[PDB]
């Protein structure tokens, strides 16, 4: 009873608990800044008690990261379940995917759900335990009555449904939001072991702020394109390196003058990994870091090797790859931008726009705070569920009948009240 | 929740035990044969016919209509008409004599309610006109005439206690019994009209009902002014408030099938000037009680009481409340005459705010008045009448829902509903705001138009489940 | 106040030439372009702070030896292993090289950590130099645009 | 440019009908309607 009620504190206080994790780790950045060698070592200038505060904080921050996830496990997780048990059960009714449709080998997220349906508990958090009966009464006349009923169905150690719980934690693990914080806990664990990896927590600054999650999103936005593009650069560079191998092996001398034990780059592994280190990253190309051609038959041929390496590789292929992130960043902010526009241009529901409601002064704000005002359609839909079907009005009972059907034509298409009349 | 539908199915299973075996018709036959009879025979039928229905079982509602149309028994409705000519009034004459009958009637119309609840617009029209049969019998007209003679009697009971004002237990027990008469029969006149078959709306629009509903306001005003006066009169008041609730449920339901400057809206504005006088009470009577909750716990009654438990004296009330400059002194007397004057002069904030009950009713009134405005504006008959009720709508604009839907008439109508305090408050803060911003971006980024309104509730059902979480936290 | 101190010391006196910025309309805009999108910028540069700090820790733990500012080690061999100095190395050197750290460090030449140094490096170069500079570069330009 | 020419084509198949040219908006009046105008009414292979 002390366990559950204290756990109610964490869900209330999670967002302060998670923001404080960034506040704490930001000081761990400030204190890991003070290392040096001797084998590893910590110098503490201006204070002698600050290294035991790292002993404090390391234990502090980790178990905070333990108290956040166990607070998260009842904060959004059951909603995640709620979403997932919803996903299944509507598709058991409307699609009958484990009755009829049998989803593909791809999207194991579908195929993960096969196990759970046999369990007793299956729609725990969906408020609608009658689904499992309703699927039997829809499809069991057709295909199998007691075949589908075969498909569907101290004190703490034997109370729980095992097959549910195995499924559940599987879905918990496949959450991006959980698995981040899960991955955040494991970095905290190893900080109690070794305090070095402990300040890698500062990448909460990325997913913390909304403008920096986007930039790393910008990396993987156009990633399907990117990897194919970088692969291009792999290949092109491999093409130059073969030509270099066959025609121009002598030009490579890392060493001094040749009188030193003259280090040269002719082995193909090393020569290819030369240009990705040197030739890609030079910014001036290979022809910065090599013997300048000075009097050979292959003098001219080296240059034509070179500028081509420089227009194709450095000028085109880097900068595209550079660009393709930036372009994704530029896209992605523009997708963020348009949304903020779209809330101000058009009405979210009736879609009409700003212009029709600027006819009345201060009018689009009224159409956003009186007429549609998104929360009401939420709250109306509560209101339908909060009452009984006897007490429903003809308008309400309509809608409720629309709703149980899932037919959705109750919303204003564009013909909202002002547009309907005069 | 889940315990209830399986119980609802237990209900429906015990109903199924019967009406599959033709029990539906036995009700429908016996009444039809008992033409004018209000024998015990008929009383037993109706409590069966209710029990067959009980909950809007549509199978029966289907089967009930089947027997009426197939075997075209004009006698049934002819029998029901004669019922309502008889059933009951309250009385006043014998009440004088009882100083030294409804149970049939309540359940008559509860039967008739359940004939229609579930919005059988075929059946609701069947009670209008009775198409296949020879002689039409308009039940819906006659139930108004029953409610009309209900009204005059309810009116007549007030005037007998217009002077004594400490109403007898025989007065209470007689009248609270009469409260459940009307409360039920209003609910028929909802559920006749609540299925927005406007044929039934127009049929009743030209009927007398409005003159009742006018007159109930004359009751409900002048009762509430003197039902307030006692700590013993509250129990009947809780009923009379609750009737006043269901009375305005009614004409909200009458107003739902409305074009903007529609005639059925016209009538409703027409009454509010004919009965402007009395509404002035109940609008203030709510402002007597809605300002009350907003002050007695506001800033300087929770700090002004030395106790902290909730005990404040009469003089401590009268010098502080009147100084807040909300309302005037004649109503401070009215509320202190209302309060308790308890133990010597003291009064609890609990029980005094327990007469909070009016916020349920006056919601619906404020809904009514807003729906009259937003349907039928630019009538100073209404505007002046509305601006008096400003103080009421000022309480409920936080709490009144207002959406638009296209509710089957292919015009988009506007619907009002009760926003809870718990659900409003939970919506804004914790993570739900972080969940909505997350939603709003996901729609416009990848939403098809079919999929957009479909993804909508897909949020919302979560967001229902959000607050089911975040409030139990 | 800049004029006052010119009567005191004539050096700070010509810092008045930033009237060319707010004087002309096209040059106020360009410094406005700096703070236009500044709320975004500071968070972005902070990103680059962090990312660079992430590389510098890996460098600290895995690759301390590669840092030798000096000549050959026979000189009093100056190396970059203290964390303050090592972090302020990459903001001076690694951010601003335009070719990255791997321009200004020992080229890897035969270690177990030879390969591991390169993979440290190109990653530093795509993430930092190619993406994070140029974004930050861009985010001014984009604001200017 | 060239990706944008690739992009617009993918838009153009989803905006307008390939043959009758009208667009997405006229067929969103019926729910799930533009897909019907792309899979029943014109549905390119049939004209083939
Ligand atoms: Zn709208
Ligand atoms: Zn076409």
mmCIF file of N, CA, C and O in Angstrom, chain A residues 210-284:
data_model
loop_
_atom_site.group_PDB
_atom_site.id
_atom_site.type_symbol
_atom_site.label_atom_id
_atom_site.label_comp_id
_atom_site.label_asym_id
_atom_site.label_seq_id
_atom_site.Cartn_x
_atom_site.Cartn_y
_atom_site.Cartn_z
ATOM 1 N N UNK A 210 12.887 20.486 -28.304
ATOM 2 C CA UNK A 210 12.184 20.149 -29.533
ATOM 3 C C UNK A 210 12.949 20.537 -30.796
ATOM 4 O O UNK A 210 12.583 20.116 -31.892
ATOM 5 N N UNK A 211 14.003 21.336 -30.655
ATOM 6 C CA UNK A 211 14.733 21.754 -31.826
ATOM 7 C C UNK A 211 16.013 21.077 -32.094
ATOM 8 O O UNK A 211 16.726 21.334 -32.931
ATOM 9 N N UNK A 212 16.269 20.161 -31.283
ATOM 10 C CA UNK A 212 17.408 19.424 -31.339
ATOM 11 C C UNK A 212 17.086 18.014 -31.466
ATOM 12 O O UNK A 212 17.973 17.257 -31.836
ATOM 13 N N UNK A 213 15.895 17.575 -31.207
ATOM 14 C CA UNK A 213 15.481 16.274 -31.631
ATOM 15 C C UNK A 213 15.272 16.254 -33.091
ATOM 16 O O UNK A 213 15.414 15.199 -33.727
ATOM 17 N N UNK A 214 14.935 17.394 -33.636
ATOM 18 C CA UNK A 214 14.663 17.509 -34.995
ATOM 19 C C UNK A 214 15.857 17.437 -35.832
ATOM 20 O O UNK A 214 15.776 17.005 -36.975
ATOM 21 N N UNK A 215 16.961 17.849 -35.305
ATOM 22 C CA UNK A 215 18.168 17.890 -36.065
ATOM 23 C C UNK A 215 18.834 16.522 -36.161
ATOM 24 O O UNK A 215 19.482 16.177 -37.148
ATOM 25 N N UNK A 216 18.628 15.713 -35.158
ATOM 26 C CA UNK A 216 19.085 14.390 -35.252
ATOM 27 C C UNK A 216 18.013 13.612 -35.990
ATOM 28 O O UNK A 216 18.286 12.511 -36.564
ATOM 29 N N UNK A 217 16.775 14.050 -35.967
ATOM 30 C CA UNK A 217 15.785 13.460 -36.849
ATOM 31 C C UNK A 217 16.114 13.740 -38.300
ATOM 32 O O UNK A 217 15.798 12.947 -39.234
ATOM 33 N N UNK A 218 16.727 14.875 -38.519
ATOM 34 C CA UNK A 218 17.111 15.266 -39.823
ATOM 35 C C UNK A 218 18.165 14.418 -40.405
ATOM 36 O O UNK A 218 18.300 14.319 -41.604
ATOM 37 N N UNK A 219 18.907 13.787 -39.562
ATOM 38 C CA UNK A 219 19.783 12.789 -39.982
ATOM 39 C C UNK A 219 19.058 11.579 -40.509
ATOM 40 O O UNK A 219 19.380 11.037 -41.582
ATOM 41 N N UNK A 220 18.071 11.110 -39.829
ATOM 42 C CA UNK A 220 17.429 9.885 -40.285
ATOM 43 C C UNK A 220 16.165 10.113 -41.037
ATOM 44 O O UNK A 220 15.443 9.139 -41.343
ATOM 45 N N UNK A 221 15.841 11.367 -41.313
ATOM 46 C CA UNK A 221 14.737 11.644 -42.181
ATOM 47 C C UNK A 221 14.873 11.132 -43.537
ATOM 48 O O UNK A 221 14.002 10.392 -44.081
ATOM 49 N N UNK A 222 15.981 11.498 -44.078
ATOM 50 C CA UNK A 222 16.162 11.172 -45.397
ATOM 51 C C UNK A 222 17.198 10.100 -45.540
ATOM 52 O O UNK A 222 17.821 9.955 -46.526
ATOM 53 N N UNK A 223 17.317 9.314 -44.515
ATOM 54 C CA UNK A 223 18.255 8.295 -44.337
ATOM 55 C C UNK A 223 18.183 7.207 -45.355
ATOM 56 O O UNK A 223 19.196 6.568 -45.630
ATOM 57 N N UNK A 224 17.006 6.915 -45.838
ATOM 58 C CA UNK A 224 16.907 5.892 -46.854
ATOM 59 C C UNK A 224 17.559 6.300 -48.148
ATOM 60 O O UNK A 224 18.047 5.495 -48.924
ATOM 61 N N UNK A 225 17.574 7.575 -48.358
ATOM 62 C CA UNK A 225 18.230 8.138 -49.447
ATOM 63 C C UNK A 225 19.676 8.282 -49.140
ATOM 64 O O UNK A 225 20.523 8.271 -50.062
ATOM 65 N N UNK A 226 20.028 8.480 -47.887
ATOM 66 C CA UNK A 226 21.331 8.863 -47.531
ATOM 67 C C UNK A 226 22.267 7.753 -47.656
ATOM 68 O O UNK A 226 23.418 7.909 -48.150
ATOM 69 N N UNK A 227 21.859 6.614 -47.179
ATOM 70 C CA UNK A 227 22.752 5.509 -47.137
ATOM 71 C C UNK A 227 23.102 5.049 -48.549
ATOM 72 O O UNK A 227 24.211 4.582 -48.848
ATOM 73 N N UNK A 228 22.169 5.189 -49.425
ATOM 74 C CA UNK A 228 22.429 4.906 -50.808
ATOM 75 C C UNK A 228 23.311 5.915 -51.438
ATOM 76 O O UNK A 228 24.034 5.638 -52.397
ATOM 77 N N UNK A 229 23.278 7.102 -50.902
ATOM 78 C CA UNK A 229 24.113 8.142 -51.400
ATOM 79 C C UNK A 229 25.497 8.057 -50.895
ATOM 80 O O UNK A 229 26.469 8.321 -51.610
ATOM 81 N N UNK A 230 25.646 7.758 -49.647
ATOM 82 C CA UNK A 230 26.950 7.579 -49.143
ATOM 83 C C UNK A 230 27.606 6.397 -49.739
ATOM 84 O O UNK A 230 28.829 6.340 -49.901
ATOM 85 N N UNK A 231 26.834 5.386 -50.010
ATOM 86 C CA UNK A 231 27.329 4.266 -50.732
ATOM 87 C C UNK A 231 27.865 4.615 -52.054
ATOM 88 O O UNK A 231 28.774 3.938 -52.510
ATOM 89 N N UNK A 232 27.280 5.619 -52.688
ATOM 90 C CA UNK A 232 27.823 6.173 -53.874
ATOM 91 C C UNK A 232 29.202 6.705 -53.669
ATOM 92 O O UNK A 232 30.158 6.375 -54.490
ATOM 93 N N UNK A 233 29.351 7.470 -52.619
ATOM 94 C CA UNK A 233 30.628 7.998 -52.352
ATOM 95 C C UNK A 233 31.630 6.946 -52.043
ATOM 96 O O UNK A 233 32.813 7.125 -52.255
ATOM 97 N N UNK A 234 31.165 5.813 -51.522
ATOM 98 C CA UNK A 234 32.029 4.637 -51.294
ATOM 99 C C UNK A 234 32.558 4.125 -52.517
ATOM 100 O O UNK A 234 33.712 3.682 -52.601
ATOM 101 N N UNK A 235 31.690 4.101 -53.494
ATOM 102 C CA UNK A 235 32.062 3.473 -54.710
ATOM 103 C C UNK A 235 32.912 4.325 -55.522
ATOM 104 O O UNK A 235 33.831 3.830 -56.171
ATOM 105 N N UNK A 236 32.615 5.597 -55.538
ATOM 106 C CA UNK A 236 33.363 6.465 -56.344
ATOM 107 C C UNK A 236 34.759 6.560 -55.836
ATOM 108 O O UNK A 236 35.712 6.610 -56.621
ATOM 109 N N UNK A 237 34.900 6.661 -54.541
ATOM 110 C CA UNK A 237 36.158 6.695 -53.977
ATOM 111 C C UNK A 237 36.897 5.383 -54.267
ATOM 112 O O UNK A 237 38.117 5.352 -54.492
ATOM 113 N N UNK A 238 36.209 4.281 -54.247
ATOM 114 C CA UNK A 238 36.851 3.039 -54.630
ATOM 115 C C UNK A 238 37.257 2.979 -56.043
ATOM 116 O O UNK A 238 38.129 2.263 -56.384
ATOM 117 N N UNK A 239 36.628 3.741 -56.882
ATOM 118 C CA UNK A 239 37.047 3.755 -58.208
ATOM 119 C C UNK A 239 38.308 4.535 -58.325
ATOM 120 O O UNK A 239 39.187 4.157 -59.112
ATOM 121 N N UNK A 240 38.458 5.629 -57.627
ATOM 122 C CA UNK A 240 39.712 6.362 -57.693
ATOM 123 C C UNK A 240 40.846 5.629 -57.071
ATOM 124 O O UNK A 240 42.010 5.779 -57.507
ATOM 125 N N UNK A 241 40.550 4.828 -56.091
ATOM 126 C CA UNK A 241 41.607 4.213 -55.433
ATOM 127 C C UNK A 241 42.163 3.064 -56.193
ATOM 128 O O UNK A 241 43.290 2.589 -55.915
ATOM 129 N N UNK A 242 41.429 2.529 -57.097
ATOM 130 C CA UNK A 242 41.969 1.522 -57.917
ATOM 131 C C UNK A 242 42.861 2.080 -58.988
ATOM 132 O O UNK A 242 43.907 1.523 -59.337
ATOM 133 N N UNK A 243 42.473 3.174 -59.526
ATOM 134 C CA UNK A 243 43.299 3.868 -60.464
ATOM 135 C C UNK A 243 44.519 4.356 -59.861
ATOM 136 O O UNK A 243 45.585 4.394 -60.524
ATOM 137 N N UNK A 244 44.429 4.770 -58.644
ATOM 138 C CA UNK A 244 45.591 5.110 -57.965
ATOM 139 C C UNK A 244 46.474 3.907 -57.744
ATOM 140 O O UNK A 244 47.686 3.989 -57.780
ATOM 141 N N UNK A 245 45.900 2.773 -57.413
ATOM 142 C CA UNK A 245 46.651 1.553 -57.206
ATOM 143 C C UNK A 245 47.391 1.066 -58.404
ATOM 144 O O UNK A 245 48.508 0.611 -58.304
ATOM 145 N N UNK A 246 46.779 1.191 -59.546
ATOM 146 C CA UNK A 246 47.349 0.682 -60.709
ATOM 147 C C UNK A 246 48.211 1.648 -61.401
ATOM 148 O O UNK A 246 49.181 1.213 -61.985
ATOM 149 N N UNK A 247 47.954 2.918 -61.332
ATOM 150 C CA UNK A 247 48.743 3.830 -62.043
ATOM 151 C C UNK A 247 49.662 4.692 -61.224
ATOM 152 O O UNK A 247 50.641 5.159 -61.765
ATOM 153 N N UNK A 248 49.369 4.898 -59.976
ATOM 154 C CA UNK A 248 50.016 5.915 -59.236
ATOM 155 C C UNK A 248 50.388 5.494 -57.811
ATOM 156 O O UNK A 248 50.060 6.162 -56.773
ATOM 157 N N UNK A 249 51.040 4.358 -57.714
ATOM 158 C CA UNK A 249 51.347 3.865 -56.351
ATOM 159 C C UNK A 249 52.475 4.593 -55.652
ATOM 160 O O UNK A 249 52.555 4.584 -54.461
ATOM 161 N N UNK A 250 53.357 5.182 -56.427
ATOM 162 C CA UNK A 250 54.572 5.770 -55.918
ATOM 163 C C UNK A 250 54.423 7.056 -55.266
ATOM 164 O O UNK A 250 55.333 7.426 -54.515
ATOM 165 N N UNK A 251 53.317 7.731 -55.520
ATOM 166 C CA UNK A 251 53.124 8.997 -55.031
ATOM 167 C C UNK A 251 52.813 9.047 -53.580
ATOM 168 O O UNK A 251 52.926 10.122 -52.955
ATOM 169 N N UNK A 252 52.466 7.922 -53.008
ATOM 170 C CA UNK A 252 52.117 7.857 -51.621
ATOM 171 C C UNK A 252 53.361 7.671 -50.721
ATOM 172 O O UNK A 252 53.949 6.683 -50.701
ATOM 173 N N UNK A 253 53.715 8.665 -49.945
ATOM 174 C CA UNK A 253 54.859 8.581 -48.998
ATOM 175 C C UNK A 253 54.497 9.432 -47.851
ATOM 176 O O UNK A 253 54.566 10.647 -47.864
ATOM 177 N N UNK A 254 54.042 8.773 -46.835
ATOM 178 C CA UNK A 254 53.797 9.413 -45.610
ATOM 179 C C UNK A 254 55.105 9.891 -44.956
ATOM 180 O O UNK A 254 55.066 10.807 -44.133
ATOM 181 N N UNK A 255 56.237 9.266 -45.272
ATOM 182 C CA UNK A 255 57.435 9.449 -44.515
ATOM 183 C C UNK A 255 58.188 10.698 -44.883
ATOM 184 O O UNK A 255 57.735 11.509 -45.687
ATOM 185 N N UNK A 256 59.356 10.840 -44.271
ATOM 186 C CA UNK A 256 60.274 11.928 -44.581
ATOM 187 C C UNK A 256 61.342 11.427 -45.558
ATOM 188 O O UNK A 256 62.176 10.588 -45.197
ATOM 189 N N UNK A 257 61.247 11.899 -46.807
ATOM 190 C CA UNK A 257 62.312 11.861 -47.797
ATOM 191 C C UNK A 257 62.629 10.488 -48.387
ATOM 192 O O UNK A 257 63.288 10.399 -49.415
ATOM 193 N N UNK A 258 62.158 9.419 -47.757
ATOM 194 C CA UNK A 258 62.513 8.077 -48.204
ATOM 195 C C UNK A 258 63.749 7.505 -47.513
ATOM 196 O O UNK A 258 63.999 6.297 -47.490
ATOM 197 N N UNK A 259 64.560 8.389 -46.953
ATOM 198 C CA UNK A 259 65.714 7.969 -46.164
ATOM 199 C C UNK A 259 65.255 7.357 -44.825
ATOM 200 O O UNK A 259 65.903 6.462 -44.296
ATOM 201 N N UNK A 260 64.137 7.853 -44.296
ATOM 202 C CA UNK A 260 63.414 7.244 -43.179
ATOM 203 C C UNK A 260 62.800 5.916 -43.682
ATOM 204 O O UNK A 260 62.758 5.680 -44.901
ATOM 205 N N UNK A 261 62.326 5.024 -42.765
ATOM 206 C CA UNK A 261 61.699 3.788 -43.251
ATOM 207 C C UNK A 261 60.411 4.037 -44.034
ATOM 208 O O UNK A 261 59.361 3.889 -43.475
ATOM 209 N N UNK A 262 60.558 4.338 -45.330
ATOM 210 C CA UNK A 262 59.579 5.035 -46.154
ATOM 211 C C UNK A 262 58.208 4.387 -46.215
ATOM 212 O O UNK A 262 58.009 3.369 -46.831
ATOM 213 N N UNK A 263 57.262 4.989 -45.509
ATOM 214 C CA UNK A 263 55.910 4.467 -45.379
ATOM 215 C C UNK A 263 55.093 4.866 -46.601
ATOM 216 O O UNK A 263 54.933 5.997 -46.854
ATOM 217 N N UNK A 264 54.583 3.897 -47.312
ATOM 218 C CA UNK A 264 53.851 4.137 -48.503
ATOM 219 C C UNK A 264 52.509 3.390 -48.421
ATOM 220 O O UNK A 264 52.353 2.370 -47.763
ATOM 221 N N UNK A 265 51.567 3.897 -49.179
ATOM 222 C CA UNK A 265 50.219 3.429 -49.217
ATOM 223 C C UNK A 265 49.888 2.671 -50.526
ATOM 224 O O UNK A 265 49.418 3.244 -51.480
ATOM 225 N N UNK A 266 50.186 1.385 -50.576
ATOM 226 C CA UNK A 266 49.862 0.552 -51.807
ATOM 227 C C UNK A 266 48.985 -0.616 -51.536
ATOM 228 O O UNK A 266 48.369 -1.079 -52.413
ATOM 229 N N UNK A 267 48.948 -1.127 -50.330
ATOM 230 C CA UNK A 267 48.022 -2.200 -50.007
ATOM 231 C C UNK A 267 46.578 -1.689 -50.062
ATOM 232 O O UNK A 267 46.261 -0.641 -49.613
ATOM 233 N N UNK A 268 45.712 -2.451 -50.635
ATOM 234 C CA UNK A 268 44.419 -1.993 -51.057
ATOM 235 C C UNK A 268 43.489 -1.699 -49.979
ATOM 236 O O UNK A 268 42.666 -0.892 -50.130
ATOM 237 N N UNK A 269 43.571 -2.400 -48.882
ATOM 238 C CA UNK A 269 42.836 -2.058 -47.747
ATOM 239 C C UNK A 269 43.294 -0.781 -47.226
ATOM 240 O O UNK A 269 42.487 0.037 -46.820
ATOM 241 N N UNK A 270 44.587 -0.599 -47.110
ATOM 242 C CA UNK A 270 45.094 0.588 -46.501
ATOM 243 C C UNK A 270 44.912 1.754 -47.452
ATOM 244 O O UNK A 270 44.714 2.920 -47.017
ATOM 245 N N UNK A 271 44.999 1.489 -48.750
ATOM 246 C CA UNK A 271 44.896 2.535 -49.733
ATOM 247 C C UNK A 271 43.485 3.032 -49.865
ATOM 248 O O UNK A 271 43.247 4.182 -50.112
ATOM 249 N N UNK A 272 42.533 2.169 -49.752
ATOM 250 C CA UNK A 272 41.140 2.582 -49.731
ATOM 251 C C UNK A 272 40.802 3.296 -48.485
ATOM 252 O O UNK A 272 40.059 4.203 -48.544
ATOM 253 N N UNK A 273 41.291 2.858 -47.342
ATOM 254 C CA UNK A 273 41.030 3.538 -46.084
ATOM 255 C C UNK A 273 41.937 4.768 -45.985
ATOM 256 O O UNK A 273 41.782 5.585 -45.078
ATOM 257 N N UNK A 274 42.842 4.962 -46.906
ATOM 258 C CA UNK A 274 43.477 6.248 -47.044
ATOM 259 C C UNK A 274 42.533 7.334 -47.523
ATOM 260 O O UNK A 274 42.463 8.379 -46.957
ATOM 261 N N UNK A 275 41.781 7.100 -48.559
ATOM 262 C CA UNK A 275 41.005 8.127 -49.130
ATOM 263 C C UNK A 275 39.736 8.436 -48.365
ATOM 264 O O UNK A 275 39.260 9.572 -48.402
ATOM 265 N N UNK A 276 39.225 7.496 -47.615
ATOM 266 C CA UNK A 276 38.163 7.876 -46.820
ATOM 267 C C UNK A 276 38.708 8.738 -45.661
ATOM 268 O O UNK A 276 38.009 9.570 -45.075
ATOM 269 N N UNK A 277 39.905 8.531 -45.179
ATOM 270 C CA UNK A 277 40.491 9.396 -44.123
ATOM 271 C C UNK A 277 41.039 10.585 -44.687
ATOM 272 O O UNK A 277 40.806 11.630 -44.208
ATOM 273 N N UNK A 278 41.794 10.459 -45.752
ATOM 274 C CA UNK A 278 42.464 11.572 -46.300
ATOM 275 C C UNK A 278 41.679 12.196 -47.445
ATOM 276 O O UNK A 278 41.357 13.396 -47.391
ATOM 277 N N UNK A 279 41.383 11.431 -48.468
ATOM 278 C CA UNK A 279 40.803 12.002 -49.641
ATOM 279 C C UNK A 279 39.409 12.543 -49.492
ATOM 280 O O UNK A 279 39.123 13.539 -50.102
ATOM 281 N N UNK A 280 38.562 11.909 -48.676
ATOM 282 C CA UNK A 280 37.265 12.487 -48.399
ATOM 283 C C UNK A 280 37.367 13.700 -47.559
ATOM 284 O O UNK A 280 36.782 14.689 -47.822
ATOM 285 N N UNK A 281 38.160 13.649 -46.546
ATOM 286 C CA UNK A 281 38.081 14.617 -45.482
ATOM 287 C C UNK A 281 39.041 15.740 -45.633
ATOM 288 O O UNK A 281 39.250 16.531 -44.666
ATOM 289 N N UNK A 282 39.713 15.831 -46.785
ATOM 290 C CA UNK A 282 40.762 16.852 -46.852
ATOM 291 C C UNK A 282 40.202 18.156 -47.046
ATOM 292 O O UNK A 282 40.746 19.128 -46.475
ATOM 293 N N UNK A 283 39.110 18.203 -47.808
ATOM 294 C CA UNK A 283 38.485 19.433 -48.182
ATOM 295 C C UNK A 283 39.182 20.077 -49.327
ATOM 296 O O UNK A 283 38.659 21.025 -49.825
ATOM 297 N N UNK A 284 40.413 19.644 -49.652
ATOM 298 C CA UNK A 284 41.165 20.014 -50.821
ATOM 299 C C UNK A 284 41.477 18.797 -51.651
ATOM 300 O O UNK A 284 41.852 18.922 -52.772
#
